[PDB]
Amino acid sequence: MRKFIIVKNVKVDGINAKSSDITVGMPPATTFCGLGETMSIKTGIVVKAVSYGSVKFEVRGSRFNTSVTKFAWQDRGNGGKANNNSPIQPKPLADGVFTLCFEVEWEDCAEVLVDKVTNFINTARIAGGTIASFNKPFVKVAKDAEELASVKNAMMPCYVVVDCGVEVNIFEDAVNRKLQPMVNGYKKLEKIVDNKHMRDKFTPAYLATPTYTMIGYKMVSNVDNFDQALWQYGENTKVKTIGGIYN
Amino acid sequence: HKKGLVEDPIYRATKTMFTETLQCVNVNGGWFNYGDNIDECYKIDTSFITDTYVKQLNRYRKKLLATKHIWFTLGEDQKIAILQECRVALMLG
DNA sequence: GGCTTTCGTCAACCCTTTGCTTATCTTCCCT
DNA sequence: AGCAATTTAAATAGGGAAGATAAGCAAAGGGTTGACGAAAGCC
RNA sequence: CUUAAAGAGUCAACCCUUUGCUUAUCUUCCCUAUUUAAAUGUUAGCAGCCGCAUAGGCUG
């Protein structure tokens, strides 16, 4: 027995489009799983999965180059060079209207759940982008599978993410089978021995290289199983769909 | 006259027990029609205090008092069916 | 003893010019 | 002061012409976006 | 606590000019629109004269 809260038409601008070194565009499912665990921390409603779809999404720039951001002189000790233009590190920006659907388990009324999600989203930040606007979130429940599809079709219109898996690698199949690659998680390289320059000193830290899976965009109504669009934190330091690989 | 209606999806998802569902039955489930004359709707006179009404209320309340010890020994299924019978007899009367 | 400023150091490309998908709809039935 | 009738049938076919051309210029710019290493005054 | 955290792309403009889409065409034959029927619904609310009446009565 499943419960969901849907925030439709989440207009967000200033999204850090740099998903990884080789992916620029839509934020991956690690971003929205991070947003889900962020509310698990601030609001206390513990979130299993998030199904996110893109209503609108434009990467700022041309069709072959992204619009770089005019950097500001914010480091310490480079005064004197501040009159000249700051050097640009690559961070593409994008705008996106999203539709989010969080699997939550809740025991109180739907009004306080909607208010808690609204108070989170008013202080949230989708992929480094300020949430410009969002409709009032609404609670829908998936008692059975037809009710699961009711929740699924309540995200209309949006293009959700379905996992199609890795055959050999990322570049090969992106040309061959023409699917989109995105960060489904990370791979740990080395333990980090210096916790002085970090957010926490006690949380263990690892250098990571983003693993990618290959995904497709399908409209939420054309997705047969809603579990193939709900991304959640898998126990391989990755994220994964509940329904597995989309067929 | 009519049963309360619960619009809440989480409440419809989770509520199972007798009181634990009944605590979710609010005034907004059909009773609260429009709500602009609430203060006149809750200023009340007490002209019921008569002979036969008070003795009837006392004898029935003490009847309940004497029998409610078997009510807690019932199961959920019993409570639901017994209260359905009580509601049916109440609309009948 | 670092420390913060400014000047000197080291380079060298082969490019290409839209789709990705493509939207949540009535038979029985008796009141 | 509303009443205005019903069915029945609506054409078969033959044609939609080719021949010509569809300019040549000249433009299409760069201006900022550099981090380590190394002298070198300075607390 | 989401490759989290952060960032002003600004400016400027002469698309010019030129032009022959002309030419000739048989649309054409054919043929039954036929037959009915109450306009009813009171189908009219008038003309004088008795009067102060545009109140009320009478006359045919």
Coordinates of C-alpha atoms (C1' of nucleotides) in Angstrom, one line a residue:
Chain A
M1 CA 0.0 0.0 0.0
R2 CA 1.7 3.1 -1.4
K3 CA 1.4 6.9 -0.8
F4 CA 2.6 9.7 -3.0
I5 CA 2.7 13.5 -3.0
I6 CA 3.1 15.2 -6.3
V7 CA 4.4 18.7 -6.9
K8 CA 3.4 19.6 -10.5
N9 CA 5.0 22.3 -12.7
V10 CA 8.1 23.0 -10.6
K11 CA 9.5 25.9 -12.6
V12 CA 13.2 26.0 -11.6
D13 CA 15.8 28.3 -13.1
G14 CA 19.6 28.4 -12.6
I15 CA 19.9 24.6 -12.6
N16 CA 23.5 23.5 -12.5
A17 CA 23.3 21.6 -15.9
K18 CA 26.7 20.0 -15.4
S19 CA 25.5 16.6 -14.4
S20 CA 29.0 15.2 -14.8
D21 CA 32.1 15.8 -16.9
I22 CA 30.5 14.1 -20.0
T23 CA 26.8 14.9 -19.3
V24 CA 25.3 18.4 -19.5
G25 CA 21.6 18.9 -19.5
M26 CA 18.8 17.4 -17.3
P27 CA 19.9 16.7 -13.7
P28 CA 20.2 13.0 -13.0
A29 CA 18.3 10.8 -10.6
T30 CA 21.0 11.2 -8.0
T31 CA 20.0 14.9 -7.8
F32 CA 16.3 14.1 -7.2
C33 CA 17.2 11.3 -4.8
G34 CA 19.3 13.8 -3.0
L35 CA 16.4 16.2 -2.9
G36 CA 14.2 13.4 -1.5
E37 CA 16.7 12.6 1.3
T38 CA 17.0 16.4 1.9
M39 CA 13.4 16.5 2.9
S40 CA 13.8 13.3 4.8
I41 CA 16.3 15.4 6.8
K42 CA 14.5 18.8 7.1
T43 CA 10.8 17.7 7.2
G44 CA 11.3 14.3 8.7
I45 CA 9.1 12.6 6.2
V46 CA 11.2 9.7 5.1
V47 CA 11.2 9.2 1.4
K48 CA 11.7 5.9 -0.4
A49 CA 11.5 6.9 -4.1
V50 CA 11.1 9.9 -6.3
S51 CA 9.6 9.9 -9.8
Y52 CA 10.6 13.1 -11.6
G53 CA 9.5 14.2 -15.1
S54 CA 10.5 17.2 -17.2
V55 CA 7.7 19.4 -18.4
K56 CA 10.1 22.0 -19.9
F57 CA 13.9 22.1 -20.0
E58 CA 16.3 24.4 -21.8
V59 CA 20.1 24.4 -21.4
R60 CA 21.3 28.0 -21.6
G61 CA 23.4 28.3 -24.7
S62 CA 23.4 27.3 -28.4
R63 CA 22.7 23.9 -29.8
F64 CA 26.4 22.9 -29.6
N65 CA 27.8 25.1 -26.7
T66 CA 26.4 26.0 -23.3
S67 CA 26.3 29.6 -22.1
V68 CA 29.1 29.8 -19.5
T69 CA 28.6 31.8 -16.3
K70 CA 30.5 35.1 -15.8
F71 CA 32.5 34.2 -12.7
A72 CA 32.9 36.6 -9.8
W73 CA 36.2 37.2 -8.0
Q74 CA 35.3 35.4 -4.7
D75 CA 38.5 33.6 -3.8
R76 CA 40.9 35.1 -1.2
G77 CA 44.2 36.6 -2.0
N78 CA 43.7 37.4 -5.7
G79 CA 43.0 41.1 -5.2
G80 CA 44.7 43.2 -7.8
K81 CA 43.6 40.8 -10.4
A82 CA 40.0 41.6 -9.4
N83 CA 39.7 44.4 -11.9
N84 CA 40.1 42.0 -14.8
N85 CA 37.5 39.4 -15.7
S86 CA 37.4 36.4 -13.5
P87 CA 38.4 33.1 -15.1
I88 CA 35.6 30.8 -16.0
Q89 CA 35.4 27.3 -14.8
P90 CA 32.9 25.2 -16.8
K91 CA 29.4 25.2 -15.2
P92 CA 26.5 25.2 -17.6
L93 CA 23.2 26.6 -16.4
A94 CA 19.7 25.6 -17.4
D95 CA 16.1 26.3 -16.8
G96 CA 13.5 23.6 -16.1
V97 CA 9.9 23.1 -15.3
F98 CA 9.6 19.7 -13.5
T99 CA 7.0 17.5 -12.0
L100 CA 8.1 15.6 -8.9
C101 CA 6.3 12.7 -7.2
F102 CA 7.6 11.5 -3.9
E103 CA 6.8 8.1 -2.4
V104 CA 6.2 9.0 1.2
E105 CA 4.8 7.1 4.2
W106 CA 2.7 9.3 6.3
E107 CA 0.4 8.8 9.3
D108 CA -1.3 12.2 9.6
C109 CA -3.7 14.2 7.5
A110 CA -2.8 15.2 3.9
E111 CA -3.0 18.9 4.7
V112 CA 0.0 18.9 7.1
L113 CA 1.9 16.6 4.6
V114 CA 1.2 19.2 1.8
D115 CA 2.2 22.0 4.1
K116 CA 5.5 20.3 5.1
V117 CA 6.4 19.5 1.5
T118 CA 5.5 23.1 0.5
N119 CA 7.6 24.5 3.4
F120 CA 10.5 22.3 2.2
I121 CA 10.1 23.3 -1.5
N122 CA 10.0 27.0 -0.6
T123 CA 13.4 26.5 1.0
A124 CA 14.6 23.8 -1.6
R125 CA 16.9 24.1 -4.6
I126 CA 16.5 21.7 -7.5
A127 CA 20.0 21.0 -8.9
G128 CA 21.4 24.2 -7.7
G129 CA 18.5 26.2 -9.2
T130 CA 16.1 28.5 -7.4
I131 CA 12.6 27.1 -7.5
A132 CA 10.8 29.9 -9.4
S133 CA 7.3 28.6 -9.0
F134 CA 5.4 25.4 -8.2
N135 CA 1.8 24.3 -8.0
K136 CA 0.3 23.3 -4.7
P137 CA 1.3 19.7 -4.1
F138 CA -1.4 17.1 -3.9
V139 CA -1.5 13.7 -2.2
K140 CA -2.5 10.6 -4.1
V141 CA -2.4 7.0 -2.9
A142 CA -1.6 3.8 -4.8
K143 CA -3.6 1.1 -3.0
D144 CA -3.5 -1.2 -6.0
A145 CA -1.9 -1.2 -9.4
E146 CA -4.7 0.7 -11.1
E147 CA -4.3 3.2 -8.3
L148 CA -0.6 3.3 -9.0
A149 CA -1.4 4.2 -12.5
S150 CA -3.8 6.9 -11.2
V151 CA -0.8 8.5 -9.4
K152 CA 1.3 7.9 -12.5
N153 CA -1.2 9.7 -14.8
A154 CA -1.5 12.5 -12.3
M155 CA 1.9 13.8 -13.3
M156 CA 0.7 14.7 -16.8
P157 CA 2.3 16.3 -18.6
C158 CA 5.9 15.3 -17.9
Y159 CA 8.6 13.1 -19.5
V160 CA 9.9 10.8 -16.7
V161 CA 13.2 8.9 -16.7
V162 CA 13.2 5.1 -17.3
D163 CA 16.4 3.0 -16.9
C164 CA 17.4 1.0 -19.9
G165 CA 20.7 -0.4 -18.6
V166 CA 24.3 -0.6 -19.9
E167 CA 25.2 -3.2 -22.5
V168 CA 28.9 -2.5 -23.1
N169 CA 29.6 1.1 -22.2
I170 CA 28.1 4.6 -22.5
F171 CA 29.4 6.1 -25.8
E172 CA 28.9 3.0 -27.9
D173 CA 25.2 2.5 -27.1
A174 CA 24.4 6.2 -27.1
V175 CA 25.3 6.2 -30.8
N176 CA 23.9 2.7 -31.5
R177 CA 20.7 2.4 -29.6
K178 CA 20.3 6.2 -29.2
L179 CA 19.5 6.5 -25.5
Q180 CA 20.5 9.2 -23.1
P181 CA 23.2 8.7 -20.5
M182 CA 23.0 10.0 -17.0
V183 CA 24.5 9.6 -13.5
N184 CA 22.8 6.7 -11.7
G185 CA 25.4 6.9 -8.9
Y186 CA 29.1 7.1 -8.2
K187 CA 32.1 4.8 -7.9
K188 CA 34.4 5.2 -4.9
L189 CA 38.0 5.6 -5.7
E190 CA 40.0 6.5 -2.5
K191 CA 39.3 7.1 1.1
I192 CA 39.7 10.8 2.0
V193 CA 42.1 11.3 4.9
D194 CA 41.6 15.1 5.2
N195 CA 38.3 16.1 6.7
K196 CA 39.3 19.6 7.6
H197 CA 38.1 21.2 4.3
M198 CA 34.7 19.4 4.3
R199 CA 31.1 19.9 5.3
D200 CA 31.3 17.4 8.2
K201 CA 34.4 16.2 10.0
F202 CA 32.8 12.9 11.1
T203 CA 31.0 11.8 8.0
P204 CA 33.3 9.5 6.0
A205 CA 34.3 10.9 2.6
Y206 CA 35.4 9.3 -0.7
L207 CA 36.6 10.7 -4.0
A208 CA 34.1 9.5 -6.6
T209 CA 33.8 9.0 -10.3
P210 CA 30.2 9.1 -11.6
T211 CA 28.9 5.8 -12.9
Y212 CA 26.3 6.2 -15.6
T213 CA 23.4 4.1 -16.8
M214 CA 21.6 4.6 -20.0
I215 CA 18.1 6.0 -19.9
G216 CA 15.2 7.0 -22.0
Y217 CA 12.5 9.7 -21.8
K218 CA 9.0 8.4 -22.0
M219 CA 5.8 10.4 -21.2
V220 CA 4.5 9.3 -17.8
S221 CA 1.2 7.9 -19.3
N222 CA 3.1 5.9 -21.9
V223 CA 5.1 4.2 -19.1
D224 CA 3.5 0.9 -18.4
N225 CA 4.8 0.4 -14.8
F226 CA 5.2 3.4 -12.6
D227 CA 7.9 1.5 -10.6
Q228 CA 10.2 1.9 -13.7
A229 CA 10.1 5.6 -13.2
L230 CA 10.5 5.9 -9.4
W231 CA 14.2 6.2 -8.7
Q232 CA 15.5 5.4 -5.2
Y233 CA 18.9 4.9 -3.5
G234 CA 20.2 1.5 -4.2
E235 CA 22.7 -0.3 -2.0
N236 CA 25.5 -0.2 -4.5
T237 CA 26.3 3.5 -3.8
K238 CA 24.1 4.1 -6.8
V239 CA 20.4 4.9 -7.6
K240 CA 18.0 2.6 -9.4
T241 CA 14.4 2.2 -10.4
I242 CA 12.0 0.0 -8.4
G243 CA 10.8 -1.7 -11.6
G244 CA 14.4 -2.3 -12.9
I245 CA 15.3 -2.0 -16.5
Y246 CA 12.7 -0.6 -18.8
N247 CA 11.9 -3.0 -21.6
Chain B
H1 CA -28.9 11.1 9.0
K2 CA -25.8 10.6 6.9
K3 CA -22.3 9.2 7.4
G4 CA -19.2 11.3 7.4
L5 CA -17.1 11.3 4.3
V6 CA -13.3 11.4 4.4
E7 CA -11.6 13.0 1.4
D8 CA -8.1 12.5 2.9
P9 CA -5.9 10.2 0.9
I10 CA -3.5 9.3 3.7
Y11 CA -6.4 8.7 6.1
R12 CA -8.1 6.5 3.4
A13 CA -4.7 4.8 3.0
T14 CA -4.0 4.0 6.6
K15 CA -7.0 4.2 8.9
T16 CA -8.3 0.8 10.0
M17 CA -9.4 0.7 13.6
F18 CA -12.7 1.9 15.2
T19 CA -11.7 5.1 17.0
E20 CA -8.5 5.5 15.0
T21 CA -10.6 6.0 11.9
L22 CA -13.4 7.8 13.8
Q23 CA -10.9 10.5 14.9
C24 CA -10.5 11.5 11.2
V25 CA -14.3 12.1 10.8
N26 CA -14.4 15.9 10.9
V27 CA -17.1 18.5 10.3
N28 CA -15.9 19.1 6.7
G29 CA -17.2 15.7 5.6
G30 CA -20.6 17.0 4.7
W31 CA -21.9 18.6 7.8
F32 CA -20.1 22.0 7.4
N33 CA -22.2 23.3 4.5
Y34 CA -21.3 27.0 4.2
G35 CA -20.5 28.3 7.6
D36 CA -21.3 32.0 8.2
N37 CA -23.8 31.8 11.1
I38 CA -21.8 29.4 13.3
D39 CA -22.2 31.5 16.5
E40 CA -26.0 31.5 16.1
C41 CA -25.7 27.7 15.3
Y42 CA -24.0 27.1 18.7
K43 CA -26.0 29.3 21.0
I44 CA -28.4 26.9 22.6
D45 CA -31.3 26.8 25.1
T46 CA -31.7 24.1 27.7
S47 CA -35.5 23.7 27.9
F48 CA -35.2 19.9 27.7
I49 CA -34.8 19.5 31.5
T50 CA -38.2 18.0 32.2
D51 CA -39.4 15.0 34.2
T52 CA -39.7 12.1 31.8
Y53 CA -36.8 13.2 29.5
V54 CA -34.4 13.3 32.5
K55 CA -35.5 10.0 33.9
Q56 CA -35.4 8.3 30.5
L57 CA -31.9 9.7 29.9
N58 CA -30.9 8.5 33.4
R59 CA -32.2 5.0 33.0
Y60 CA -30.7 4.5 29.6
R61 CA -27.3 6.0 30.6
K62 CA -27.1 3.7 33.6
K63 CA -28.1 0.8 31.3
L64 CA -25.1 1.7 29.2
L65 CA -23.0 2.1 32.3
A66 CA -23.9 -1.4 33.5
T67 CA -23.3 -3.1 30.1
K68 CA -20.3 -1.3 28.7
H69 CA -18.0 -3.7 30.4
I70 CA -18.7 -6.3 27.7
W71 CA -18.1 -3.7 25.0
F72 CA -14.3 -3.7 25.4
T73 CA -14.3 -7.5 25.1
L74 CA -15.6 -7.2 21.6
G75 CA -13.6 -7.4 18.4
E76 CA -13.3 -4.8 15.7
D77 CA -15.6 -6.8 13.5
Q78 CA -18.2 -6.9 16.3
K79 CA -18.1 -3.2 17.1
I80 CA -18.6 -2.3 13.4
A81 CA -21.6 -4.7 12.9
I82 CA -23.1 -3.8 16.3
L83 CA -22.9 -0.1 15.6
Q84 CA -24.3 -0.6 12.1
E85 CA -27.3 -2.4 13.8
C86 CA -27.6 0.5 16.2
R87 CA -27.5 3.1 13.5
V88 CA -30.2 1.2 11.5
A89 CA -32.4 0.9 14.5
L90 CA -31.8 4.6 15.2
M91 CA -32.9 5.7 11.8
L92 CA -35.9 3.3 12.1
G93 CA -37.0 5.0 15.3
Chain C
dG1 C1' 59.3 32.1 8.6
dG2 C1' 55.8 32.5 6.2
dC3 C1' 53.3 35.7 3.3
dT4 C1' 51.4 38.4 0.1
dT5 C1' 51.9 40.9 -4.0
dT6 C1' 53.3 41.2 -9.1
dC7 C1' 56.0 39.5 -13.0
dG8 C1' 57.6 35.7 -15.8
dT9 C1' 56.4 30.8 -17.7
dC10 C1' 54.2 27.5 -21.1
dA11 C1' 51.3 26.8 -24.6
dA12 C1' 48.8 25.8 -29.6
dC13 C1' 42.1 22.8 -32.6
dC14 C1' 39.5 18.9 -37.0
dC15 C1' 35.4 19.6 -37.1
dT16 C1' 28.9 19.0 -36.3
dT17 C1' 24.4 22.8 -37.1
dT18 C1' 17.7 18.6 -34.6
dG19 C1' 15.0 15.1 -32.5
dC20 C1' 15.5 13.0 -27.7
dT21 C1' 9.3 11.5 -27.4
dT22 C1' 5.2 12.5 -29.5
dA23 C1' -0.7 13.5 -23.5
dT24 C1' -4.4 10.7 -18.5
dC25 C1' -12.0 9.1 -23.2
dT26 C1' -17.7 3.9 -22.0
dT27 C1' -19.1 -1.8 -22.9
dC28 C1' -23.2 -4.4 -19.3
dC29 C1' -26.6 -2.9 -15.5
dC30 C1' -30.8 -1.1 -12.8
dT31 C1' -32.2 2.4 -10.2
Chain D
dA1 C1' -52.8 30.0 -30.2
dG2 C1' -50.3 25.4 -32.2
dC3 C1' -51.0 22.7 -36.4
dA4 C1' -46.7 22.4 -42.2
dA5 C1' -46.9 14.4 -43.9
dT6 C1' -44.8 10.4 -45.7
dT7 C1' -40.7 6.9 -49.8
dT8 C1' -37.8 7.4 -54.0
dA9 C1' -33.8 8.3 -56.4
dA10 C1' -29.5 12.2 -57.4
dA11 C1' -25.1 9.8 -64.2
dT12 C1' -22.3 6.7 -66.2
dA13 C1' -16.8 8.6 -69.4
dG14 C1' -13.0 11.2 -71.5
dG15 C1' -9.2 14.4 -71.0
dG16 C1' -6.4 17.2 -67.4
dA17 C1' -0.2 19.6 -72.8
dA18 C1' 4.8 20.1 -72.9
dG19 C1' 9.4 23.8 -73.6
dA20 C1' 12.4 27.6 -71.8
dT21 C1' 14.9 29.5 -67.9
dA22 C1' 15.6 29.9 -62.0
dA23 C1' 22.3 35.7 -61.8
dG24 C1' 26.5 37.1 -60.9
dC25 C1' 28.9 40.5 -56.6
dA26 C1' 30.7 41.3 -51.4
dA27 C1' 30.7 41.4 -46.6
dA28 C1' 30.4 37.3 -42.2
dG29 C1' 35.7 41.3 -36.9
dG30 C1' 37.8 40.8 -32.3
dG31 C1' 37.7 42.9 -27.5
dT32 C1' 37.8 39.7 -21.4
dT33 C1' 37.3 35.3 -19.0
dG34 C1' 45.8 32.0 -16.4
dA35 C1' 47.3 28.6 -12.9
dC36 C1' 51.4 27.4 -11.0
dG37 C1' 56.5 29.0 -10.5
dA38 C1' 59.5 32.5 -9.3
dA39 C1' 61.6 36.8 -7.6
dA40 C1' 60.7 39.9 -3.9
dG41 C1' 59.2 43.5 -0.4
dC42 C1' 56.6 42.8 4.2
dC43 C1' 54.8 41.7 8.7
Chain E
rC1 C1' 21.2 19.0 2.4
rU2 C1' 20.7 17.7 -4.9
rU3 C1' 29.1 17.6 -9.5
rA4 C1' 25.7 21.1 -2.8
rA5 C1' 28.0 26.1 -2.0
rA6 C1' 29.0 31.1 -6.3
rG7 C1' 29.0 34.4 -10.3
rA8 C1' 26.0 41.1 -15.1
rG9 C1' 28.0 39.0 -21.6
rU10 C1' 27.7 43.4 -22.9
rC11 C1' 28.2 46.7 -27.4
rA12 C1' 27.7 48.0 -32.8
rA13 C1' 25.2 47.8 -37.5
rC14 C1' 22.3 50.4 -45.2
rC15 C1' 21.2 43.4 -48.4
rC16 C1' 21.5 45.3 -52.5
rU17 C1' 20.0 46.1 -57.4
rU18 C1' 18.0 44.3 -62.3
rU19 C1' 14.0 41.8 -64.5
rG20 C1' 8.3 40.0 -71.1
rC21 C1' 5.4 33.3 -68.7
rU22 C1' 4.2 33.5 -72.7
rU23 C1' 1.6 30.1 -76.3
rA24 C1' -3.6 26.9 -78.6
rU25 C1' -7.7 24.6 -76.6
rC26 C1' -15.7 21.6 -78.8
rU27 C1' -17.5 19.4 -72.0
rU28 C1' -21.6 16.7 -74.1
rC29 C1' -24.7 14.0 -74.6
rC30 C1' -29.8 11.3 -71.8
rC31 C1' -34.3 12.3 -69.1
rU32 C1' -42.1 11.6 -66.2
rA33 C1' -41.4 14.4 -59.6
rU34 C1' -45.3 12.3 -59.2
rU35 C1' -51.1 11.1 -56.0
rU36 C1' -53.8 13.1 -51.8
rA37 C1' -55.9 16.9 -48.5
rA38 C1' -62.2 20.4 -43.9
rA39 C1' -58.0 24.9 -41.4
rU40 C1' -60.2 24.0 -37.2
rG41 C1' -59.7 26.1 -32.5
rU42 C1' -67.3 29.9 -30.8
rU43 C1' -62.7 33.3 -35.0
rA44 C1' -65.7 37.6 -33.0
rG45 C1' -65.5 40.6 -29.1
rC46 C1' -69.8 45.1 -32.5
rA47 C1' -73.5 49.3 -34.0
rG48 C1' -77.2 53.3 -30.3
rC49 C1' -79.1 55.0 -26.0
rC50 C1' -80.1 55.3 -20.7
rG51 C1' -77.1 58.0 -18.2
rC52 C1' -71.7 62.9 -14.9
rA53 C1' -68.5 58.5 -15.6
rU54 C1' -63.8 55.9 -19.7
rA55 C1' -69.1 53.1 -12.8
rG56 C1' -73.3 50.4 -13.9
rG57 C1' -77.6 48.8 -17.2
rC58 C1' -80.7 48.3 -21.8
rU59 C1' -81.5 47.5 -27.3
rG60 C1' -80.4 43.6 -31.7

